[PDB]
């Protein structure tokens, strides 16, 4: 059962403008963690925007469960996805406001839970003001790697089936990645996951990695695989990575 197929999709963002998508078809397992890499501008952030229907094909079909987004309830897609957004943390408002600004009047019970799985939870609770803390600068000053863990614990505070991971924008410190890598396990357990890596090597440990190329996945398999493949893109981008 595949809880997320592109089936022949082709896209462009404006009527004259360039495809961006081109014939893709993938198709992803319930539970499976994918890892999408791929060179600047190759379709990876594009591919994710299709799932919470920003925007719409011109041809084919993207499902979810097995249900055409074309037809499905907006509000159940909204319910079914849970992004982690790069710099969205609102600067202005508490930390608890911010890993709500979903469904404002849920339960601290539910948020406490969602930063705990986050790996934020810990510092939250160290903090003067607790989970009433404005996050900004004149407030606790958080850290980038402490406010990642706060955008994590949003997007799974209403518990979806379905963990996007943006691609990072920014590198945080050791002892928030290093938290979050030993708390992934626990963050994806029970979810169908989508991360888009700007480090190849963050996703080494996917159950399958999709390698886009010109808005086609040229390539897609395990890390090992891929590696075994001759010529292969993903092999060249490792190389190019590496120490």
């Known amino acids: 059962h595949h809880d997320i197929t592109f089936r022949n999709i082709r896209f462009r963002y404006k009527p004259d403008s360039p495809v961006i998508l081109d014939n893709i078809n993938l198709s992803i397992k319930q539970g499976e963690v994918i890892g999408i890499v791929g060179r600047s501008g190759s379709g990876k952030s ?4 299709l799932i919470q229907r920003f925007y719409i094909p011109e041809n084919g079909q993207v499902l ?49 839970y969602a930063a705990k799985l986050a790996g934020a939870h810990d510092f939250i609770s160290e903090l003067r003001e607790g989970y009433n803390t404005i ?28 963990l996007i991971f943006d691609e990072a924008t920014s590198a945080l410190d050791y002892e928030s990645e290093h938290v979050i890598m030993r708390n992934m396990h626990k963050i994806c357990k029970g979810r169908t ?51």
């Open 64 to 112: 979810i469960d097995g249900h055409d987004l074309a037809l499905a309830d907006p509000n159940w897609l909204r319910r079914q996805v849970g992004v982690v957004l790069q710099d969205n943390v609102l600067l202005n408002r508490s930390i608890i406001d911010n890993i709500s600004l979903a469904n404002p009047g849920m339960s601290v019970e539910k948020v406490i």
């Open 193 to 243: 996951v989508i991360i888009i890596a700007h480090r190849l090597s963050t996703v080494k440990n996917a159950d399958r990695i999709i390698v886009m190329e010109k808005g086609k996945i040229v390539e897609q398999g395990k890390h090992k695989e891929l590696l075994s493949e001759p010529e292969s893109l993903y092999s060249y981008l490792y190389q190019l990575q590496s120490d």
């Open 135 to 162: 996050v900004g600068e004149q407030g606790a000053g958080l850290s980038g790697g402490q406010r990642q863990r706060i955008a994590i614990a949003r997007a799974l505070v209403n518990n979806p089936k379905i």
């Open 46 to 49: 594009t591919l994710t925007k």
